[PDB]
Each structure stands twice: as structure tokens, then as C-alpha cells.
Design a protein around this ligand. Sequence first.
Ligand SMILES: CCCC(=O)OC[C@H](COP(=O)(O)O[C@H]1[C@H](O)[C@@H](O)[C@H](OP(=O)(O)O)[C@@H](OP(=O)(O)O)[C@H]1O)OC(=O)CCC
Ligand SMILES: CCCC(=O)OC[C@H](COP(=O)(O)O[C@H]1[C@H](O)[C@@H](O)[C@H](OP(=O)(O)O)[C@@H](OP(=O)(O)O)[C@H]1O)OC(=O)CCC
Ligand SMILES: CCCC(=O)OC[C@H](COP(=O)(O)O[C@H]1[C@H](O)[C@@H](O)[C@H](OP(=O)(O)O)[C@@H](OP(=O)(O)O)[C@H]1O)OC(=O)CCC
Ligand SMILES: CCCC(=O)OC[C@H](COP(=O)(O)O[C@H]1[C@H](O)[C@@H](O)[C@H](OP(=O)(O)O)[C@@H](OP(=O)(O)O)[C@H]1O)OC(=O)CCC
Ligand SMILES: Cc1c(C)c2c(c(C)c1O)CC[C@@](C)(CCC[C@H](C)CCC[C@H](C)CCCC(C)C)O2
Ligand SMILES: Cc1c(C)c2c(c(C)c1O)CC[C@@](C)(CCC[C@H](C)CCC[C@H](C)CCCC(C)C)O2
Ligand SMILES: Cc1c(C)c2c(c(C)c1O)CC[C@@](C)(CCC[C@H](C)CCC[C@H](C)CCCC(C)C)O2
Ligand SMILES: Cc1c(C)c2c(c(C)c1O)CC[C@@](C)(CCC[C@H](C)CCC[C@H](C)CCCC(C)C)O2
Lengths: 250, 251, 251, 253
Amino acid sequence: PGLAELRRRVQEAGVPQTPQPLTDAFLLRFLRARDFDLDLAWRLMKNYYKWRAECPELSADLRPRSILGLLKAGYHGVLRSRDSTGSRVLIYRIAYWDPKVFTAYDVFRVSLITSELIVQEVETQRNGVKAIFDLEGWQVSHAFQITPSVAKKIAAVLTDSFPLKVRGIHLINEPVIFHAVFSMIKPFLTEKIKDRIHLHGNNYKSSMLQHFPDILPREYGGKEFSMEDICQEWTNFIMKSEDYLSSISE
Amino acid sequence: QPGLAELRRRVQEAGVPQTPQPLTDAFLLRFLRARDFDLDLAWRLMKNYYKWRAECPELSADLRPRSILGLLKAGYHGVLRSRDSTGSRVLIYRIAYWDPKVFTAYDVFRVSLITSELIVQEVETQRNGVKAIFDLEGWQVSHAFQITPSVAKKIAAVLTDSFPLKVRGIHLINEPVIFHAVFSMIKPFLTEKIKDRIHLHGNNYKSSMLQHFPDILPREYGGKEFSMEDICQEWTNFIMKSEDYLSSISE
Amino acid sequence: QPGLAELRRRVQEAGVPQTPQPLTDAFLLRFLRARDFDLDLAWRLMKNYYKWRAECPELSADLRPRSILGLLKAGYHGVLRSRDSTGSRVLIYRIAYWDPKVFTAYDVFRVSLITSELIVQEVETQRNGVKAIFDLEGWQVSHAFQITPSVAKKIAAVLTDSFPLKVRGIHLINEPVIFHAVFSMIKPFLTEKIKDRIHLHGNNYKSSMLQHFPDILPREYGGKEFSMEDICQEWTNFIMKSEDYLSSISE
Amino acid sequence: LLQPGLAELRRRVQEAGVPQTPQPLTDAFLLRFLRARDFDLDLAWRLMKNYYKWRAECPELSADLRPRSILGLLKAGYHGVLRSRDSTGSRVLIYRIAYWDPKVFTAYDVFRVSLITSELIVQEVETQRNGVKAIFDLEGWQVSHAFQITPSVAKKIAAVLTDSFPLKVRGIHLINEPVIFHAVFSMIKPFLTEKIKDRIHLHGNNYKSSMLQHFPDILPREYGGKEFSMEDICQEWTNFIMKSEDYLSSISE
Ligand SMILES: CCCC(=O)OC[C@H](COP(=O)(O)O[C@H]1[C@H](O)[C@@H](O)[C@H](OP(=O)(O)O)[C@@H](OP(=O)(O)O)[C@H]1O)OC(=O)CCC
Ligand SMILES: CCCC(=O)OC[C@H](COP(=O)(O)O[C@H]1[C@H](O)[C@@H](O)[C@H](OP(=O)(O)O)[C@@H](OP(=O)(O)O)[C@H]1O)OC(=O)CCC
Ligand SMILES: CCCC(=O)OC[C@H](COP(=O)(O)O[C@H]1[C@H](O)[C@@H](O)[C@H](OP(=O)(O)O)[C@@H](OP(=O)(O)O)[C@H]1O)OC(=O)CCC
Ligand SMILES: CCCC(=O)OC[C@H](COP(=O)(O)O[C@H]1[C@H](O)[C@@H](O)[C@H](OP(=O)(O)O)[C@@H](OP(=O)(O)O)[C@H]1O)OC(=O)CCC
Ligand SMILES: Cc1c(C)c2c(c(C)c1O)CC[C@@](C)(CCC[C@H](C)CCC[C@H](C)CCCC(C)C)O2
Ligand SMILES: Cc1c(C)c2c(c(C)c1O)CC[C@@](C)(CCC[C@H](C)CCC[C@H](C)CCCC(C)C)O2
Ligand SMILES: Cc1c(C)c2c(c(C)c1O)CC[C@@](C)(CCC[C@H](C)CCC[C@H](C)CCCC(C)C)O2
Ligand SMILES: Cc1c(C)c2c(c(C)c1O)CC[C@@](C)(CCC[C@H](C)CCC[C@H](C)CCCC(C)C)O2
């Protein structure tokens, strides 16, 4: 169908054949991220490659060892269950990011690594992801790291530049500023990615439980497992996938 | 009363405007009561009162309520029938009923000036001061445009030892989270004491407010005897009842 | 022309509304000439043009000038009698003669929307593009009042691949410094290209503007031959003589 | 040979019980306050009480005036003073943000540099008579600087300059200010007296000619002069501070 077109276009523009094999599976990432709308999936593919060549410091190296320290510290875990809509749910925790040891680029890379791992799941291509950022422990040094360059790339990676549907961004324990940072974007923003950005603040337990019943760690309201558990499980996973993360590295 | 005879002299010797507010004992006592009969502080307070009055004629000269009656009618302002448990008088201001395409920040300030002028006659109010509740539900970009740096100063100035009323509490409810950032920037410029008297309750104000004002708030805010519409109407009638006294103290 | 036949085909396949603009050979060209005859890019624009037309009915539906005639009469907007050294059409907007008490942002928008549709007809203006000048002297808080976020996105979208005209220059003069503050934050969310084509000459413009548009500016900005007055009458005479054609392309 | 208000000021200082140390209450000292207020006894006394009030509220700024803790900042080229006075006898002080590394130095360290310099120049009768003008070159201004200027620092800055230091502020000139500073300035303008508002100058990126009017013939090459560089006057001032390090100890606690 539109897969027949996509491949042809890919040949024509001389889309880099490496490191990712241009398989049918890989092309359906783009098709699925755009509900099989050919123009749109192709525009995304182009933006994907465009973003990678602009950012070799981020895109070229997906090998996890360089950031093993950050995984071990407890920055990042992925829930064992999908949410009610088939989304994968990812958790990032600022407290467990030493801004002295890891730069914003190192932290970004974590997400890139996780994204590349979860994009292979057909269910995840279909139902996208939801990212939770627990901002407790937010410092001034974290902010320092978030430059215009970095802000811009955070945007693109959710602005038609990576084959994943962002179904929701949840922030908990954000400092007051984030709301100012955000009151000045709410009405500036589209209607689309505005029903998907949730600032829960300090009093987050109840609203978090409404979006993600029966599947959250004890820290955020659940009762089956802890953040430390899912951090280790996702880290074990990421390491069990280091050969694959090399195969798709420059 | 301690210092009334001294203040009487100072007032003459300094040549304080004898009109429009006539220098009755009851008038000079406001200043004494406002500073717990400490003559010096009272005298400093009275000089500040006049200094502000002369630097903001566009605010102090005219206390005739008719210009702002539309605003009162719209349900912007009311005063609770009861005093709080420490004798304070309690004023309620509702932002949602200030239509900033029809009334400026000056019109709104003038409403607080009218109300303050009327309540300071109550000895109990002079003794136990005042508390103001600001309901910021419905706050607009358009309200903010009216709060110029120039208006911010005049607000601050009247509150800085320049009106004969003890400020016992400022309560915000339903404030936009921005109000917290602005607060952080202001805090170091404020005394310890006044900081302890500013409360930002948020959208979940109901139970934290009920601790400061049990039994007296209107139904909208957790009370159960009367409505905001009633106290607005009551206070509106009262301002207009006083329209002549207000004109008599107007330049 | 390379892709002239091809484009119509895609339009016929998508069934793009037959009217109010008839899908003539001349009307399609605009989108090709806008994207240097790039078949894929011409299309995207044309999709986004109709896409933007349906999102903002209250802007794109009516292009009848007579609603804004008084705004034109006031002398808000003018266009140079000559093209620039690159063939761009130069457009001037003077905020001073926009009365936010009489005309809204949607109204002032409509003026630009009318001028644009007229000048895009001209082959050369398609090819070389357009430069805007915003004489922001006389800027008031009641003007920013009208530039809502709801309007800011509608403004930005118009310039964001949603109209068949080449933005070749945005010049701002007599900016209230706060315009530099707003521009700081739009920088990251801007491509390198149009960033260069944006100029903030400030209070000192005469020299910086002269090197961009010599021989062809009006006296107010360092010309000689005519005045803003003249070209506001002429450009007003032109939009009014077009009122018939403007009606045909309305709904 | 009697200075107006001097003998009275001494007695006011005695009735109040003003701290004898670290700064001895010599006539030379009292005169700072008198001259700062054109020999108006009352206002010089208000001023002197304010100086002492602000010192107690900011001991982390006021106690240590020893130069060695901020020597690194001076070596870096942050601060200089012009050899010449301007045409009305003011000492002219130049501060350069670009040479301030906020990783190494806090706003308090920076603030202390001004306090040292101010304490040295106040000893000059001419500077007591004709005040100071200060040029802040904000080229290089970073987010990391911004974050050092908390509301608390903003207040302490405000307070020092509000009737609390015996130096006449005769001009504040900013060059290469980010646009933000104009917004901030618009917000505080109502809070400022007319006389001070007319003494604040934001010159921008194109400062060259505008600054040349206030300070002809006397500026460094970097700002349109011709006789010396900023590097020269930074080093000359560093050395001067360091040769004053003994006096600076004697006015510390
Ligand atoms: C650089 C300028 C800043 C900006 O624009 O931000 C918007 C950005 C991007 O939003 P979007 O990429 O347009 O959102 C996608 C979004 O990424 C994608 O997931 C959506 O698919 P789906 O969730 O509806 O299945 C998809 O739906 P449509 O193509 O409109 O049908 C879009 O809504 O959203 C970001 O998540 C917010 C971070 C600031
Ligand atoms: C941006 C500049 C702000 C500033 O400079 O503070 C000025 C003003 C200060 O209000 P005050 O006049 O100091 O408050 C009086 C306050 O008005 C008065 O009621 C207090 O007496 P009492 O309530 O305890 O009897 C009285 O206590 P003391 O006489 O100082 O012991 C004071 O707290 O505070 C205002 O509430 C500003 C709020 C935005
Ligand atoms: C909410 C999103 C806001 C946004 O980002 O839009 C900004 C827009 C972006 O620039 P552009 O309108 O996409 O620029 C076009 C531009 O519209 C078009 O005229 C240009 O053609 P030409 O003038 O170079 O021949 C064309 O050149 P290229 O095809 O890229 O080589 C493009 O650069 O530039 C605006 O004109 C700036 C106004 C603030
Ligand atoms: C957020 C609130 C900020 C604020 O209020 O600060 C006011 C402060 C007070 O300036 P001052 O200490 O009064 O200034 C002196 C000023 O220090 C002194 O030089 C002036 O004397 P002279 O130089 O003209 O002889 C003297 O003249 P007057 O005797 O008071 O008329 C004053 O202008 O001025 C500061 O320099 C702040 C500048 C940004
Ligand atoms: C494909 C993909 C990537 C690559 C991704 C995310 C998502 C949902 C994706 O689908 C979420 C996070 C992000 C954009 C990287 C975040 C990196 C920074 C350094 C984290 C630290 C601090 C943030 C300022 C905290 C809040 C950010 C949210 C508003 C996104 O990485
Ligand atoms: C004697 C007296 C006056 C005269 C007075 C008040 C009080 C408590 C008094 O005792 C409180 C209000 C104020 C200062 C007038 C404020 C008028 C403004 C324009 C209201 C609109 C919006 C404000 C952003 C609401 C928040 C107010 C607090 C931050 C003070 O007038
Ligand atoms: C096709 C087209 C349109 C339709 C257009 C413009 C250009 C260059 C076009 O090519 C420029 C002006 C604009 C966006 C009209 C703006 C409407 C408002 C009400 C103007 C008033 C004030 C603005 C706050 C000025 C800022 C915008 C400039 C920086 C461009 O309409
Ligand atoms: C006696 C005295 C002191 C003590 C003084 C100054 C002057 C003129 C004095 O006479 C000027 C500077 C100041 C207030 C210290 C400022 C320290 C800050 C941390 C500098 C860095 C950045 C500021 C954002 C620069 C702009 C400030 C000006 C608008 C004053 O210290």
C-alpha cells in the first residue's frame, strides 16, 4: 500500500542505509507513528534523519555504558504494565541526576536509548508513550544545563522528529516557576499537545492514580513494587540490549 | 488619651491641611489608636497619610462613590456582617466582578479607599484592624495590564505606614500560581511580621480559610448563613447611604 | 511549467473547494512561484493555506474592504510606489493611526489579508516576495491588549507556510524596547533563514533603513518625492477599486 | 576653622553609643557623613545611622573588608578605576561582568569588591565632595549571573544605595545591557526619586558616542579613549587595593 510508496521515496532521496537497516519493520515505525498517512510518515522520516545529522553528539552513540552510572543511580524506570490505552509509561527522576557528573546530553541520551528500545514494540508504535518527570530535588545546576540548544532538541524530539507518539507528559513536584514557565505557554500552545501536558504539583497522588490506576510504584501511589525495582529491571534490560544498541550506533 | 493633647499641638504647629477632613479629636485618635498610643509613631503615621494624599490626588481627592457605583453593583466588594474572633473587620474583593474595560485600577483602588475611610470610624476597627480577602478566580491578562509599575507603587505606598488602619491579614484565594513567583520576589523587601500575615490559599482554600474565619464567611467560601450577593448589596447600600459624608471629606 | 499539470491533479483528487477562489491556472501558480516550482513544497503550502482558511473563518471568509475603509482612511497602511532593488513589494504599517477603540486586531489583520491577496496577483510580487515595515511609534498598552494568544497564533500561522507569499523582510522601527524582550524568546523557535530577514532598527533608523530601501522611501523615513499621506490615498484608492474582485473571492 | 555640625555630630554619636571599632570615630570619619549631605547635620546623622544599620543587617558583606578573598576577581579584570576624575571631580568606577566567573565567585564576593573600593575612595575629600559614577559593562551577562542576583541580593543592593553609604551617587551607566534590564528598570522607576532616575543611563550595544559625552578624554581604549587600556587600570587598581590591605584589615572585624 503506502509502504510500497515509502520505500521508493527512501531509495530516491538517498536516505542513509546505515546504521539502521531500512527494513519494512523500520519503515512501519514511521507509518504507525502517523496513522499510515504517507505524506506525514515520510515528512517524519526526513525530520528524523535531519535531526540526527544536526545532533551527532546525541544520535550517533546509543551504547548504554557511558550512562550506566545514571541508570544505577535510579534516574529512570519503565512501568511493568502498559496504561489503559496500550501506552508504555516512562519515569524520570531529577533527584537521581547528578548534574556534576552527567550533562543534559547524557540524560537526553538515556531517553533516546529507551525510545529506540521501545519503538520495536508494535503495541508501542500504535499507542505511544507517556513520560512522567518527578521534579523533586530540582536544582539550579539542572536548570543551567537546559540551554537553548537543549530546549530546542527537547522540542523536536516531540515535534515531528522521532517515530513515537507522545500521548502525555506528566510532571510531579515541579517548582512554582514551571507553572510560570508554562502559564506563558498554555495559550501560546496548540489545543493538541495541551490536553497532554499535566502539572500535578505537590498534591499529585490522587490525579496520578486517576491516569494510571493499578500500575504505579509505591512511591506514586501503587502497592505492588517500588521505583528501585523498576529502575533495576529497566537497567538490566538496557544492558541486556547493549549489542543491539551497538548495531544501531555509528 | 496619651498624646492627644500633643498631637493637637503638632497638627497646629505644622500647618496640616485643615480641610477637607476636619481635625476633630475622633480623627486624630485614629492615628493614635493605629499605633497603640505611641505618639511618635502616630505622628509619623499622620505625616505619611498626608504625604501620600498629596502625591496621589487622582486617588485621594475624590471619595464620592458615584463614579464607582457600577463596580459595587457588579458584586466586586463586600464586608462581612461579623468581625473575626480578634475583632478585625473583614473585607472581600472579587476580581471576577471587576470588568477592566469599564473600570481602571484607579477606580478599583478608590473602592478600597472609600471602604477604609468608612470603617476607620469604628473604634473597634481602629483597635483590631482589618483583614482583606482577595478572590482571584477569573483573573485576566487584562486585569494585569492595569497593574502598572506606577499602580504597584501606590498600592505599596498606602500600605507602608501611610493609612491609619492596622493590616492584620491579607488572604488570597484562587490566585494564579504566578502570584507565588511575584511573592518570592517581594518577600525580602517585606518585614518578618507582615510576611506572617500574607496567606495564599490556592483553589483548595475552603478548609484553610475556615480556620481563620469560622462561622462568618458567606456560602461561597464555606459559610452557611448568607451569600456574597447579600453582603455586596448590604455594603453597596451603605456606601451610598454615606455618599454625603464621603463628599464632605472630598477635595 | 514544471508541475503545473501535476498540481491540479492532486487538487482534483483531494476535491479542494471549487470556490470562492476558482482553481484557475493563474491561482495555482502562486503556490509554485512561492516554493520555486517545487512540486512537493507547493502542495504542502496549498494544503496549509486552505487549512488555515477553515481554522480562521472570522478572518478569511470576508475580504470586503469596506468594513476597514475608515482604518485605511486614517492612514494606517501604505505601499511604496516602487519595488525594491530585489523586486520585493514593500509594505508599511503605522500603528499610531490604529484606534483599538474603533478597530480590533482581527480588523487590522483583514487589511494585511486584503493587501496580500491583491499583490499576489502580480507575477513579480509572487517571484521576488514582500517586505513589511511596522512603524510602532504610538504603540499603546491597549494595542498589546488586542494581540491575544488566540491572535498571536493566527498571526504566526499566516507566516508559517500558510500563505502563498514570500516573506523576504520584516522591519520594525520605533519598537517599545519590550519588543526586543519578546523577540529574545522567539529566537530558538526560529529557523536561521528568516532570522536574518528580521531587522530591529530602533529609534535610530534613518541610516539603517536608507541602505535597505534608498530612492523609494517616503519623507517620514528619509525619502523626498512623496509622503505616507500620498501612498495611503493611492493604496486606499487601489483596494477600493478592487472591491468588486475582493467580493468574488469572499463567502 | 569650625566645621558646621561637627561638634554636634560627635555628641550625637556619643549619646547614641555608636561602635568605636573597627572604624575609629576620628573627625575625618565624621566628616564623611557631613560632606555626603552638604553639611546638613540632620541628614548626615540619618545617613550615619543608616550606614551602621545596614552593616549590622549584612555582616556577611560588612564585616570582612580584607582584599585577599576577592583578589582572584581583581586579577580576572572585573574592576578598575579611571586615573582621572570626570569633569565634575567624580571618581569613575568600571565593573565588567564578563570577567566575573559565577562558578568561583558569589554575588556577595562581587558586592564586596565595591565595598572595598568605596571604603578606599571615601577617604578622599574630592570624592566626598563630588561623588562617584559607576559604569557597568554587561557584555558577557549570563544566566548564571542572573541566578546569583536573588531577591535578597537585589534588596541588599537596593539598601546599600538607599541613604546608607557616605558616597554621593552621581551616575550609573550601563553599556551592553541585555534588553531585560530595560524591563526591570521600568518596573522600579516609580520607586525611584526623580533626581536618581535622571542619573541612570542605559546605553546599549551602541554606547560608544553616548558615553563619550559624559566622559571625554578619560576613558580606556575599549570604550573610546586613547591613552591606556582596561587591562592597565585593572592592574593599577589591583595593586592599590593590595597596598591598602593593611588599612583594610584595620576596618574589618
Ligand atoms: C517547536 C515549537 C514548540 C511546539 O510546537 O511544541 C508542540 C510539541 C509538538 O506537538 P506535535 O508534534 O504537533 O504533536 C503530535 C504528537 O507528537 C503525536 O503523538 C500526535 O499523534 P497522536 O498522539 O494524536 O496519535 C499528533 O497528532 P496530529 O498529527 O495532529 O493528528 C501531533 O499532535 O509538543 C510537545 O510535546 C510539547 C513540548 C513543548
Ligand atoms: C514593596 C514594598 C513593601 C514594603 O515596604 O512593606 C510595606 C507595607 C508595610 O506595612 P507596615 O505599615 O510595616 O505594617 C504595619 C501594620 O499596618 C500594622 O497593623 C502593624 O501593627 P499591629 O497590626 O501589630 O498593631 C505594624 O506593626 P509594627 O508597628 O511595625 O510593630 C506593621 O506591621 O507592607 C505592605 O503590606 C505591602 C504588601 C505588598
Ligand atoms: C508557530 C511557528 C512560528 C514560526 O516558526 O514561523 C516563523 C516563520 C518561519 O519561516 P518560513 O515562513 O517557514 O520561511 C519560508 C519563507 O516563507 C519563504 O518565503 C522562503 O522562500 P524564499 O524567500 O527564500 O525564496 C522559504 O525559503 P526556503 O524554501 O526554506 O529556502 C522559507 O524560508 O518566519 C516568519 O516569517 C517570521 C515572523 C515571526
Ligand atoms: C527598589 C527601590 C530602589 C530605591 O529606592 O533606591 C533609591 C536609592 C536612593 O537614592 P538617594 O541615597 O536618596 O540618592 C542620593 C544620592 O546618593 C546623592 O548623591 C544625592 O546628593 P547630591 O549628589 O545631588 O549632592 C542625593 O540628593 P538629595 O540630597 O537626596 O536631593 C540623593 O539623590 O538610589 C539607588 O542608587 C538605586 C538606583 C538603582
Ligand atoms: C523520543 C523521546 C525523547 C528523546 C524524550 C522524551 C520523549 C517523551 C520521547 O518520546 C521525554 C524527555 C526527552 C525530551 C528528554 C528530556 C531531557 C532532559 C535533559 C531531562 C531533564 C529535565 C527536563 C527539562 C524535565 C522536564 C521536561 C519535559 C517538559 C519534557 O526525551
Ligand atoms: C487602607 C487599605 C487600602 C487602601 C487597601 C487595602 C488595605 C488592606 C487597606 O488597609 C488592600 C487593597 C488596596 C491596597 C487596593 C488594591 C487595589 C488593587 C488595584 C486590586 C486589584 C488586584 C490586586 C493585585 C489584588 C491583590 C492585593 C494584595 C496583593 C494587596 O487598598
Ligand atoms: C500574507 C501576510 C500577512 C497576512 C501578514 C504579513 C505578511 C508579511 C504576509 O506575507 C505581516 C503582518 C500580518 C501578520 C498582519 C498582523 C496583524 C496585526 C493586528 C498587526 C499589528 C501588530 C503586530 C503585533 C505587529 C507584529 C508582526 C510583525 C513582526 C510581522 O499579516
Ligand atoms: C557604596 C556603593 C556600593 C556598595 C555599590 C555601588 C555604588 C555606586 C556605591 O556607591 C554600585 C554597585 C553595588 C550596588 C554592588 C552591585 C553588586 C552586583 C552584585 C553587581 C553585579 C551585577 C548587577 C546586576 C549590576 C547592575 C547594578 C546597577 C544597576 C547598580 O555596590
